[PDB]
A paper describes a structure:
The structure of TcHpHbR has a similar architecture to TbHpHbR, with a long three α-helical bundle and small membrane-distal head.
Each receptor makes the same interactions with haemoglobin, and the receptor conformation is unaltered from that of unliganded receptor, with a root-mean-square deviation of 0.6 Å. The interaction surface can be divided into two subsites, with interactions made with the α-subunit of one haemoglobin dimer and the β-subunit of the second haemoglobin dimer. The membrane-distal binding site interacts with the α-subunit of haemoglobin. While an alignment of these structures shows little alteration in the membrane-distal binding site, the path of helix I of the receptor is altered in TbHpHbR so that it no longer forms the membrane-proximal binding site for the Hb β-subunit, thereby reducing the total interaction surface area by nearly half.
Residue numbers in the entry:
A (entry chain E): 2 to 141
B (entry chain C): 2 to 142
C (entry chain A): 3 to 251
D (entry chain B): 3 to 247
E (entry chain D): 3 to 147
F (entry chain F): 3 to 146
Write the structure that this text describes.
Amino acid sequence: VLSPADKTNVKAAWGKVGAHAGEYGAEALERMFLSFPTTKTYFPHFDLSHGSAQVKGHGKKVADALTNAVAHVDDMPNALSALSDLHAHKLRVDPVNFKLLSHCLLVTLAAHLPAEFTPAVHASLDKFLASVSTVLTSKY
Amino acid sequence: VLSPADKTNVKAAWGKVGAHAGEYGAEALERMFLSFPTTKTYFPHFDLSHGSAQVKGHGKKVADALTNAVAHVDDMPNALSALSDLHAHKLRVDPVNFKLLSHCLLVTLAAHLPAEFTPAVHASLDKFLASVSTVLTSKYR
Amino acid sequence: GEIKVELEDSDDVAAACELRAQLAGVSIASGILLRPAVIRNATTEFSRKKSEDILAKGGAAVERASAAVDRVSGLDKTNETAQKVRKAAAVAHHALEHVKEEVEIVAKKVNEIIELTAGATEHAKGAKANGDASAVKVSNLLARAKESENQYVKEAAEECSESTNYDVTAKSLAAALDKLPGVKEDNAVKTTFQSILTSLDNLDKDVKSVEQRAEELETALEKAERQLEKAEKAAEEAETESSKVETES
Amino acid sequence: GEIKVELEDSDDVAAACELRAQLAGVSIASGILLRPAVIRNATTEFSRKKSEDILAKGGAAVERASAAVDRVSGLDKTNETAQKVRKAAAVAHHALEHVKEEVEIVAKKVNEIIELTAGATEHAKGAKANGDASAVKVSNLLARAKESENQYVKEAAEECSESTNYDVTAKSLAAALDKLPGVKEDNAVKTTFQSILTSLDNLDKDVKSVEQRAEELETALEKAERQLEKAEKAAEEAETESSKV
Amino acid sequence: HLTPEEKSAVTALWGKVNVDEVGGEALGRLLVVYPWTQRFFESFGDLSTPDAVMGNPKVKAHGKKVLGAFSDGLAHLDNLKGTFATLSELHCDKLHVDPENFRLLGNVLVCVLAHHFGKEFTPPVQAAYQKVVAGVANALAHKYH
Amino acid sequence: HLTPEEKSAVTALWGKVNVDEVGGEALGRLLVVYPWTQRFFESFGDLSTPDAVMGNPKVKAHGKKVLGAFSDGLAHLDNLKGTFATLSELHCDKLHVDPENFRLLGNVLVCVLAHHFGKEFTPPVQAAYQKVVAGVANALAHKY
Ligand code: HEM
Ligand code: HEM
Ligand code: HEM
Ligand code: HEM
């Protein structure tokens, strides 16, 4: 359960993400496919080549979801009620994969935010991304 | 999230447990220590021998907690607000262990409720025991 | 090139909005469609090895009966009792010609599934690429409508949301395209829209045919197994007479 | 035997209720107390066989210098080249005398931790076994108070909850026992009660002493490591002048 | 690995399991308790309700072939790595099945055996089957590490 | 498990890590992000706040000895099972550290390296370190 202190750190760190949200999401996914290649199976119809525009496109869609989730931190289950169903009933993604993208998102934020990614913030970001995963896995 | 259908199955299955609550608890724990010996470390000061009264005693305390959790299924986080803190801040139990006891509780209920533990009920009991684990692991950060 | 025909009214804008969402949802649709047929192509390597083995066990059950019939060649020549010790070996080789027959089927089906799956992937990427591309052109058309000198069009384009339709099919999309015949037939997207309808229809025709070839392949492996049981129990059967006879003629 | 003295009033019942909860909370308390000192006893064997290899590396650094001083032996006590080997080898054997000294410390501390931990476990088991046995006798006393002819005693025993005190200490328990001097001194539980207070106090005295022997141990392994660095760099120094002839 | 006393209780109980059906009961239960596993069996037909799943002849059928692998590996306990080697290629490098799912099915089998044997599936025999199913899970996920 | 091109980028980056402190930064970060991990280090003293945890000389100290084990596995990539064998006995037979905790620390190190190197810690080099930390996790949990 995200504390008022946890919430402030998320909003502040994703606040610094801002304009680059789309490039980050694309990197998080590219990092995921490379580190955990069995994740690529959910995208057989995608061009997963380096710096693909399909991956650039998907990247923004994943990040804007997260931008919305941050904006609605207090009521996150309703904010992502659409996706929690899409992932559960239509894509049938194994829940163990939500853990993998969540870590690659932290790897992305560590590489790009040298100042703000502090131990206090590292905890609050992982706390949050776990909560986002929990919402998406809620309809299985 | 437990559905009204999931909730009915829990209440019905734990309703059939009844007086045997402190019996099935002692069993679940004895099964856990034998299958996952790593769990015994949280009880260095206990007599973990076969049919111990320490384990029989602890068994009832774990089951009555679950009897309360069933009674308060709609508001489970407040129902177990005491334990979620005890386990998190005082005991410091690794969350991965909550998964192990939860399975041994299902193994206990499968062995004793031949009719009740149907596929429909198996799903609803595991969903519930995961929710109980979630509550207890909620105060670790 | 961009779409030249402008959005005439508030009802037209609403159809284009659902069309931008349908075209977006093509990306999800093909993925969900293609994925099970890829899981079936993954097992073709394993299911072929199972056939080469049932053949190996068959050939070996044939060789155990062929050695058992060689021992009793010079014991009873054109006699009565040994006419039976040759009969089970005949049943054994006939059963093998059926095992060798079904294994040829499994082989052809494996090649058919590979060729079908490799094909369906191209139809799913093809429908996806042409999907995302055309939706861009439609979004730009709505973006212009947010600037339109008409107050009803300006409000309808404004109220209009950037969404993705999760329940897209070849049917639902054609149905959305029927709502705007001017967009449907505009030279900038005309062929791209036609390319999606065909690609989607061919992708379903392939995924279904992969489920089909698999059903035919599993049937052959069961039939190869039935005949391996028939061969082995005919080998071990009159080959039982080979252990009881050590006598001289 | 059971407690013979009956609960006189509503305030007496309330103390017995808390005392029960305190006695129940003894199991939790000892478990939490004993557990870290068991984690420290788990590292003893690793640290001993770590000290054993610092001695082996030391003895070997001594033997590399002892062979290097045997080669340069065919020379007088005048050459700077011949004297730097003999002097570094002296520094090398002196450094070993302290490696060998600290390893004896590590050995004695390992035995001390084992003996302390094995001991503390018995205290923790003894305090829980006695803490839980006596709570039974107190519960039965409250159960009898739920039957009392006093309207106030029957209600106080009824309102009274079956709970477990999570913040139990040797202090808090003695404090709960002071509230009921008649129960505390009753012959049925008197000694069991005294056995908990001692067992708990000795269990804390042991857990703390295990934290102490380990700091005194880790210090020795660091000091054995400092002298192994001092030996090796005096030994490799002697091997520098030995290949020079 | 298992103790000779455990190897004794394990092969005892296994000789009493109805090979024809206990496999489908575990496989069906997996698809019912952990529904996402269904992505792997969309060609099986009707899986919409627990009674549609449990009834499904393809489920009971495939269930028998997966239990047959369990019966195979229960014999060669000393060599599980090689026994499941061919299957490891199918589940890992081909299907790309997450190893936890093998673990989940393993625990589901243990739940089925407890459901069927009852008081015969004692804590020490559960403990031994747990070692077996853990082994069969590792042997299958060998191609990953 | 690593390709010769990966072995090249891995040993490259590792020669640039500040051995003295990157270990304590990972170990401290573990006790801050996953607090239950503190039950093994109760003798470490002050562990109340992230600044009291990061400051702790015992944490930075033990952090250096833990990274030293990583520096060894990163030298002995062909044989990880034997390299960590002695530690497997300590982490599994004696202390019983649940293997996921090794995995958690492994991912935390990857997070620290990304935090330090930045644009130098590219998706393919992350992918290679991931193989390494997964290996070091398995090699330690070998006794299970
Ligand atoms: C951080 C958590 C995640 C978020 C916020 C997220 C967000 C979404 C969104 C917004 C879409 C589709 C929206 C659209 O195109 O209109 C979706 C689609 C998808 N997601 Fe996720 N997702 C997450 C995690 C996952 C994970 C772990 C996987 C599995 C590896 C997954 C695989 C998919 C797939 C296969 C699609 C289908 C889209 C397509 O085929 O074009 N994502 N993602
Ligand atoms: C999942 C459901 C669980 C429930 C309902 C539960 C219930 C409880 C309760 C009510 C107590 C306190 C007993 C009292 O008031 O005296 C407690 C204590 C304890 N629990 Fe849990 N628990 C659960 C899981 C866990 C797990 C997984 C572990 C082991 C890793 C754990 C280990 C302990 C320990 C060590 C104690 C202290 C026992 C003592 O020293 O007296 N339990 N349990
Ligand atoms: C862990 C214990 C498991 C064992 C012993 C096992 C065994 C096997 C066997 C023997 C087959 C092929 C038999 C045949 O075609 O003749 C196979 C097929 C398969 N297994 Fe597994 N399996 C296990 C778990 C898994 C799990 C957890 C999944 C994931 C859902 C998985 C998914 C599959 C799939 C998708 C097939 C292919 C079905 C087809 O041929 O269409 N199984 N199983
Ligand atoms: C995952 C990679 C890991 C490595 C390379 C590693 C390395 C080691 C090393 C080298 C030591 C001995 C240090 C010395 O000589 O004093 C050790 C000790 C220890 N490790 Fe680990 N470890 C790992 C993970 C774990 C984890 C996840 C935990 C639990 C949270 C664990 C808990 C311990 C404990 C309790 C000790 C005893 C240290 C002491 O208190 O003196 N470490 N670590």
